Amino acid sequence: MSLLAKIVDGKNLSFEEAYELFNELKGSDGVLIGAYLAALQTKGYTGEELAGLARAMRDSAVKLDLGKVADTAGTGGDGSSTINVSTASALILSAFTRVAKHGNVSITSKSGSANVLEALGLNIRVSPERAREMVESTNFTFIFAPAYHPALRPIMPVRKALGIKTVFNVIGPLANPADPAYQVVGVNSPELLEPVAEALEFLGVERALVVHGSGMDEVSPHRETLVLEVGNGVERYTLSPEDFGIEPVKPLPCSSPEESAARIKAVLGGSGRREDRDFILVNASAALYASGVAEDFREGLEMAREALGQGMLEKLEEIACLSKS
Amino acid sequence: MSLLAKIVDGKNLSFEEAYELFNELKGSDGVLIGAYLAALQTKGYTGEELAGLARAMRDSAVKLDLGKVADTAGTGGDGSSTINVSTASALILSAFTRVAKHGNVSITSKSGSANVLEALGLNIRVSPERAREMVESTNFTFIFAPAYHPALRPIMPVRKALGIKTVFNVIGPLANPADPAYQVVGVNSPELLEPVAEALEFLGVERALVVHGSGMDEVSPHRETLVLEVGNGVERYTLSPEDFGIEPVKPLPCSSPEESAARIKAVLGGSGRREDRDFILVNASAALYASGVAEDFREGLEMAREALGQGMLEKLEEIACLSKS
Numbered sequence: 299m300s301l302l303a304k305i306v307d308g309k310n311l312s313f314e315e316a317y318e319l320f321n322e323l324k325g326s327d328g329v330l331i332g333a334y335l336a337a338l339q340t341k342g343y344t345g346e347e348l349a350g351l352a353r354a355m356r357d358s359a360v361k362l363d364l365g366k367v368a369d370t371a372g373t374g375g376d377g378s379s380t381i382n383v384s385t386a387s388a389l390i391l392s393a394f395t396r397v398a399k400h401g402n403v404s405i406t407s408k409s410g411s412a413n414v415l416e417a418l419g420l421n422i423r424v425s426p427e428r429a430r431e432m433v434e435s436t437n438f439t440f441i442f443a444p445a446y447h448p449a450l451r452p453i454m455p456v457r458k459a460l461g462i463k464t465v466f467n468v469i470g471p472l473a474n475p476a477d478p479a480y481q482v483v484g485v486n487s488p489e490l491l492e493p494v495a496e497a498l499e500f501l502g503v504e505r506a507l508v509v510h511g512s513g514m515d516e517v518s519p520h521r522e523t524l525v526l527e528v529g530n531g532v533e534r535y536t537l538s539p540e541d542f543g544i545e546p547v548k549p550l551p552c553s554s555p556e557e558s559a560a561r562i563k564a565v566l567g568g569s570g571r572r573e574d575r576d577f578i579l580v581n582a583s584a585a586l587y588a589s590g591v592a593e594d595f596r597e598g599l600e601m602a603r604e605a606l607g608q609g610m611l612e613k614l615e616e617i618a619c620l621s622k623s
Numbered sequence: 624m625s626l627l628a629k630i631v632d633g634k635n636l637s638f639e640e641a642y643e644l645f646n647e648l649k650g651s652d653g654v655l656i657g658a659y660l661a662a663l664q665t666k667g668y669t670g671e672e673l674a675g676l677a678r679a680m681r682d683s684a685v686k687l688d689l690g691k692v693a694d695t696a697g698t699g700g701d702g703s704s705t706i707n708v709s710t711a712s713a714l715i716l717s718a719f720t721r722v723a724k725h726g727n728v729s730i731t732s733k734s735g736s737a738n739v740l741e742a743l744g745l746n747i748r749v750s751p752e753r754a755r756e757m758v759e760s761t762n763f764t765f766i767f768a769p770a771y772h773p774a775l776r777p778i779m780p781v782r783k784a785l786g787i788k789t790v791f792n793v794i795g796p797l798a799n800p801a802d803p804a805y806q807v808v809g810v811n812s813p814e815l816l817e818p819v820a821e822a823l824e825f826l827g828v829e830r831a832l833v834v835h836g837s838g839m840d841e842v843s844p845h846r847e848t849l850v851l852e853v854g855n856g857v858e859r860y861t862l863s864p865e866d867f868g869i870e871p872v873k874p875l876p877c878s879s880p881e882e883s884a885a886r887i888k889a890v891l892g893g894s895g896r897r898e899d900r901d902f903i904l905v906n907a908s909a910a911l912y913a914s915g916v917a918e919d920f921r922e923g924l925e926m927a928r929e930a931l932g933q934g935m936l937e938k939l940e941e942i943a944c945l946s947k948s
């Protein structure tokens with residue numbers, strides 16, 4: 299109970315202490331888990347704490363060694379309910395480089411990653427061998443978090459009972475057991491930009507963008523996006539739709555995973571609504587930039603827009619087929 | 624889960640919300656109680672929150688028809704473990720006015736109030752009718768919190784499992800179901816002075832002293848004591864051993880409740896160690912002052928010192944006898 303006492307007194311844990319905190323949490327009674335999650339949330343987190351917890355979560359996870367891979371994710375929470383751009387970006391990115399998309403840590407999955415992918419015809423539960431098969435021949439696989447993180451099984455009831463944002467919203471994206479070399483990570487508030495960028499440094503990522511787009515855990519196609527770039531230290535800069543070569547446009551809402559799937563598929567096949575296409579493309583651009591496929595965000599968008607068409611729809615068919623074979 | 628969300632976001636609850644929080648806590652699973660206790664501890668408390676919780680706890684408690692009564696108590700969890708002066712003060716105060724001493728909710732119960740009283744020969748669990756019998760004929764009774772607060776039955780396991788200070792350490796002294804008109808309340812840090820004084824205002828106390836004696840939840844017989852006096856608004860002042868008419872003396876540690884009982888009994892009978900006698904007497908003085916029995920702290924000590932002797936030991940015999948009859 300000394301770690302709890304440390305947290306309640308307003309003291310930030312070390313990396314090593316946060317690592318041991320995860321391991322205490324996975325074998326604790328619900329009462330103590332609840333106390334820890336609530337207390338840590340009230341205090342707020344540093345990058346060392348996030349990194350420690352994330353490292354522990356990865357170490358406890360079902361083992362998989364795909365290549366050097368990229369991943370795109372968000373903390374979620376957010377507020378508004380738009381289409382799942384991190385899924386579309388990950389699919390578009392697989393046209394250029396190896397992608398291992400880590401699944402939704404949160405239960406609130408309306409227009410959510412696993413759900414959109416199921417609706418697009420994938421089997422979302424894939425063994426580590428099947429995952430490797432999928433990355434070798436299609437450059438895409440999906441890592442479904444409940445399947446790959448058995449240590450969370452006792453944590454999940456406690457997260458439902460509490461019904462608040464916890465640290466598990468934030469470390470979900472940082473706990474991909476494939477150890478992605480490249481990451482785009484969206485955060486729901488500007489206050490998570492610094493901790494999350496720092497945590498990705500501790501986790502030894504090659505290149506990463508931590509993004510916040512004016513109230514969204516995504517790159518905005520309308521107003522400005524705050525970016526922290528991790529790689530040669532940490533670099534802060536601001537983007538706008540002009541930087542991707544598009545006219546500002548407001549993304550429009552989404553009702554259900556089936557609506558999400560159809561709109562994404564429309565965009566992936568070279569068609570779809572402008573507000574969906576440009577929103578997906580600015581997020582795809584960031585992912586191509588983070589992966590080192592594109593030199594800048596304008597080129598990232600150019601390349602992603604050109605990947606859209608019949609070839610992307612047959613790529614999606616082959617991913618689906620291969621997930622169920 | 625909106626009250627938890629409110630707390631985790633750094634918002635102070637209102638009196639009314641803290642009142643409803645108590646009632647939610649008494650019918651909740653341990654997981655949610657843990658989350659609440661830890662989160663509220665990490666945020667800190669205002670006087671409205673303490674008062675709300677304390678008011679709710681009193682309202683849920685087994686009812687009592689004692690007189691206008693006085694009480695003396697501490698939050699506990701101070702620096703370390705000296706003898707239980709709040710028990711001795713309460714006993715000495717019963718020579719002059721009606722006293723209903725509220726029992727330790729607290730886990731720091733080595734040399735703790737119920738334990739010291741058990742060691743002095745009392746049955747510490749008394750029915751409300753027996754409590755009234757004891758106040759009518761001896762001016763003293765002891766209200767054992769676990770017996771009088773059935774709402775704590777789910778709360779107490781959660782407090783043991785967590786093993787940190789919670790809000791229940793602070794509201795225990797504020798939750799005497801007899802509704803004492805007069806109170807001395809010791810606090811373990813200067814930061815609790817203002818909240819606790821404010822909470823006693825909300826709880827409609829006639830006169831109260833909230834005291835902190837240089838690292839102790841008691842009036843110090845060595846160094847200075849910070850006092851907040853509640854009555855005609857709130858008055859701040861500092862006391863020293865000179866104000867009671869004694870030479871400074873260091874209170875010395877205690878190993879067990881049986882040692883605590885013997886040292887107290889020695890002092891109560893007119894004898895005992897100087898360091899124990901003067902420490903008990905400065906705390907008794909404050910209680911006589913809070914009760915309006917004494918005009919100032921010097922007179923409070925004079926009166927308390929003169930009450931010590933054979934009459935006090937036979938008073939204690941009759942309290943013990945009457946608690947077990």
Ligand SMILES: [Cl-]
Binds near residue numbers: 360426446
């Ligand atoms: Cl698995």
Ligand code: NA
Binds near residue numbers: 425426
């Ligand atoms: Na396996």
Ligand code: NA
Binds near residue numbers: 869900901
């Ligand atoms: Na003296």
Ligand SMILES: [Zn+2]
Binds near residue numbers: 372374376515516
């Ligand atoms: Zn989102």
Ligand SMILES: [Zn+2]
């Ligand atoms: Zn640059």
Ligand SMILES: [Zn+2]
Binds near residue numbers: 669670817818
């Ligand atoms: Zn206040």
Ligand SMILES: [Zn+2]
Binds near residue numbers: 670
């Ligand atoms: Zn106030």
Ligand SMILES: [Zn+2]
Binds near residue numbers: 741
């Ligand atoms: Zn007993």
Ligand SMILES: [Zn+2]
Binds near residue numbers: 697699700
């Ligand atoms: Zn004490």
